[PDB]
Amino acid sequence: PRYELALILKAMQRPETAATLKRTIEALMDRGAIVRDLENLGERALPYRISAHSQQHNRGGYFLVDFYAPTAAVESMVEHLSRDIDVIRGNIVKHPLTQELKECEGIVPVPLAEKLYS
Amino acid sequence: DPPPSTLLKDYQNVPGIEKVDDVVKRLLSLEMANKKEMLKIKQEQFMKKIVANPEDTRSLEARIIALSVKIRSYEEHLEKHRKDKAHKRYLLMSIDQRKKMLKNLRNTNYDVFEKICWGLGIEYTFPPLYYRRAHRRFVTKKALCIRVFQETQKLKKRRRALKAAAAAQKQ
Amino acid sequence: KNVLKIRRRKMNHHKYRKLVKKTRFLRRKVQEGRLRRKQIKFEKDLRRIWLKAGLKEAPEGWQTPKIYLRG
RNA sequence: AAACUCCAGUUGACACAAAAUAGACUACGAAAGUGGCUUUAACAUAUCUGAACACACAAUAGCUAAGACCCAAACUGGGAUUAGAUACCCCACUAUGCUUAGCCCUAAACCUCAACAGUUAAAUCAACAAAACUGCUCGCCAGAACACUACGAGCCACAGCUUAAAACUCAAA
Ligand SMILES: NC(=O)c1ccc[n+]([C@@H]2O[C@H](COP(=O)([O-])OP(=O)(O)OC[C@H]3O[C@@H](n4cnc5c(N)ncnc54)[C@H](O)[C@@H]3O)[C@@H](O)[C@H]2O)c1
Ligand SMILES: [K+]
Numbered sequence: 001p002r003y004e005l006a007l008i009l010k011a012m013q014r015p016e017t018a019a020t021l022k023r024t025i026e027a028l029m030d031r032g033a034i035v036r037d038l039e040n041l042g043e044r045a046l047p048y049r050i051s052a053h054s055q056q057h058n059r060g061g062y063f064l065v066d067f068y069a070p071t072a073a074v075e076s077m078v079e080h081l082s083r084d085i086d087v088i089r090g091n092i093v094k095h096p097l098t099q100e101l102k103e104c105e106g107i108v109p110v111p112l113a114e115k116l117y118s
Numbered sequence: 119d120p121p122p123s124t125l126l127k128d129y130q131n132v133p134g135i136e137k138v139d140d141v142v143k144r145l146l147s148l149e150m151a152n153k154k155e156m157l158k159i160k161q162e163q164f165m166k167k168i169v170a171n172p173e174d175t176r177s178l179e180a181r182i183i184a185l186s187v188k189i190r191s192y193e194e195h196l197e198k199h200r201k202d203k204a205h206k207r208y209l210l211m212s213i214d215q216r217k218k219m220l221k222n223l224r225n226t227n228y229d230v231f232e233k234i235c236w237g238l239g240i241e242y243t244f245p246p247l248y249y250r251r252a253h254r255r256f257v258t259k260k261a262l263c264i265r266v267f268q269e270t271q272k273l274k275k276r277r278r279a280l281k282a283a284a285a286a287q288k289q
Numbered sequence: 290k291n292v293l294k295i296r297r298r299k300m301n302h303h304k305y306r307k308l309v310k311k312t313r314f315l316r317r318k319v320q321e322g323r324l325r326r327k328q329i330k331f332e333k334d335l336r337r338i339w340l341k342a343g344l345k346e347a348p349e350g351w352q353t354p355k356i357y358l359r360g
Numbered sequence: 361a362a363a364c365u366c367c368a369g370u371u372g373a374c375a376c377a378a379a380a381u382a383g384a385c386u387a388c389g390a391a392a393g394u395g396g397c398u399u400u401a402a403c404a405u406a407u408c409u410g411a412a413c414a415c416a417c418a419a420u421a422g423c424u425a426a427g428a429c430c431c432a433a434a435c436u437g438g439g440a441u442u443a444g445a446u447a448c449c450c451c452a453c454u455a456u457g458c459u460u461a462g463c464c465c466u467a468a469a470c471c472u473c474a475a476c477a478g479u480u481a482a483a484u485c486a487a488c489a490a491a492a493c494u495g496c497u498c499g500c501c502a503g504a505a506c507a508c509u510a511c512g513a514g515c516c517a518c519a520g521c522u523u524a525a526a527a528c529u530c531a532a533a
């Protein structure tokens with residue numbers, strides 16, 4: 001299915017950041033993934049301090065990887081990200097653009113009698 | 119299971135699907151889909167192999183095939199999740215619902231009942247006549263009563279030869 | 290509502306648990322003896338079967354198991 | 361008071377424990393239950409009804425074995441109150457609550473409302489609860505107490521569970 005990898009990388013110089021992204025995208029391809037896009041969300045201060053691989057981090061590079069992969073690739077990829085020392089935090093979610101939003105007419109009231117009795 | 123390269127049931131009959139890039143074929147195959155998509159291909163395979171009209175999904179045959187695919191999925195689930203009582207319940211309920219369908223198909227269309235059993239690999243079994251605990255006292259006694267019968271039968275045959283032998287001597 | 294029916298059952302169960310506690314060693318000796326007789330009564334039922342069928346001894350290789358022991 | 365004083369405060373490092381707010385929501389699941397995040401699998405049945413015992417489940421407590429252990433905590437020890445002992449209060453700590461693999465099979469397991477289908481016109485209807493009913497099916501009931509008992513039987517249960525009487529007694533319950 002289509003997945004979205006939310007990737008927070010250690011704050012590094014441009015050469016090491018490109019090497020980490022290439023090494024991360026190749027890991028996806030080695031597991032059968034078809035990588036669709038790579039987005040840079042920018043380097044920013046983390047919302048809180050994160051300890052990863054015997055180091056403390058206060059800033060990180062936020063990246064997204066939109067890709068398709070077999071369902072069995074997720075478990076294997078999650079294991080790969082846990083061992084990469086340049087990855088602060090990596091999470092794989094089902095791509096939000098796959099879920100189609102259902103139309104909403106509006107807010108129908110709920111009767112007070114139902115509130116109490118229910 | 120169908121090969122992973124198999125296309126999804128929705129994209130198998132679109133014109134020109136055989137000339138698209140290999141990447142596009144992977145994205146429309148079972149490899150890139152959830153297991154529920156592989157089960158739709160299995161159901162369609164059984165429907166064309168067994169039923170006379172593969173597009174009649176409301177016939178008793180199609181329901182047995184659809185439910186048989188679900189039963190196999192639960193068995194595969196429980197092979198990996200052996201303490202999942204919720205899915206163990208769904209399996210046992212699904213097996214019972216299929217038996218009720220097979221009973222009604224056997225009673226109405228035996229020729230189709232036979233093709234369903236051959237096609238799906240189902241060995242129809244008639245239910246036991248009585249439901250009662252076979253406890254230790256009964257299990258032991260029933261075993262003894264069968265041994266006693268077996269021994270009595272042997273003795274009754276050794277009382278046929280001796281009588282036969284003595285009768286011949288008189289002559 | 291009132292709980293008077295519950296209270297009667299509460300006291301009955303309390304006194305029963307209290308009686309069982311006081312006599313749990315006598316009750317254990319009684320239960321053991323009953324199980325012995327139960328095993329003997331079972332053994333007789335099986336012996337009756339082969340004897341009424343014309344056999345003089347138990348079927349060859351048959352040993353009546355102990356189906357009432359904790360083991 | 362005892363206890364602690366490798367105590368307390370700040371800062372940093374740091375979980376096999378538990379999951380603020382959302383939730384004024386009333387969803388999911390057969391029920392039991394389920395409210396941190398992600399992913400995978402996944403929520404029976406195109407007529408209904410259908411079991412103390414068949415089949416599969418079943419909070420809390422508890423058993424067996426091996427682990428974890430922050431905090432909580434039967435029990436136990438100490439301090440205190442007390443005429444004094446136990447409890448209520450304080451401190452410490454254990455079984456246990458957790459994980460794993462087996463059991464045990466209970467609850468005020470209760471919306472105290474059996475499942476399905478139908479009706480809102482008749483009389484609206486003992487009372488209260490929760491407006492009053494019809495069809496159909498299964499389960500169950502027939503004064504109180506004896507009695508969640510005795511005996512028998514079955515059960516991995518052994519101070520256990522399930523099923524479940526009678527005698528004596530009363531004119532009530
Ligand atoms: N006992 C059977 O094996 C059996 C077989 C066919 C039909 N039934 C039907 O089951 C109902 C219950 O009969 P009962 O009152 O004599 O039994 P019961 O309820 O007194 O139970 C006695 C025995 O019958 C079994 N039993 C109970 N309910 C059953 C059911 N619905 N179906 C099958 N077995 C059941 C129990 O497990 C036990 O072994 C009746 O409608 C009967 O016609 C029972
Ligand atoms: K929370």
Ligand SMILES: [K+]
Pocket residue numbers: 383
């Ligand atoms: K809340």
Ligand SMILES: [K+]
Pocket residue numbers: 470
């Ligand atoms: K209640």
Ligand SMILES: [Mg+2]
Pocket residue numbers: 297300301
């Ligand atoms: Mg009493």
Ligand SMILES: [Mg+2]
Pocket residue numbers: none
């Ligand atoms: Mg002091």
Ligand SMILES: [Mg+2]
Pocket residue numbers: 410
């Ligand atoms: Mg039914």
Ligand SMILES: [Mg+2]
Pocket residue numbers: 411
């Ligand atoms: Mg019955």
Ligand SMILES: [Mg+2]
Pocket residue numbers: 411
């Ligand atoms: Mg039932």
Ligand SMILES: [Mg+2]
Pocket residue numbers: 412
């Ligand atoms: Mg019960």
Ligand SMILES: [Mg+2]
Pocket residue numbers: 418
């Ligand atoms: Mg339980």
Ligand SMILES: [Mg+2]
Pocket residue numbers: none
């Ligand atoms: Mg436990």
Ligand SMILES: [Mg+2]
Pocket residue numbers: none
């Ligand atoms: Mg503590």
Ligand SMILES: [Mg+2]
Pocket residue numbers: none
């Ligand atoms: Mg402990």
Ligand SMILES: [Mg+2]
Pocket residue numbers: none
């Ligand atoms: Mg936990």
Ligand SMILES: [Mg+2]
Pocket residue numbers: none
């Ligand atoms: Mg409850």
Ligand SMILES: [Mg+2]
Pocket residue numbers: 474475498
């Ligand atoms: Mg019912």
Ligand SMILES: [Mg+2]
Pocket residue numbers: 485
């Ligand atoms: Mg009135």
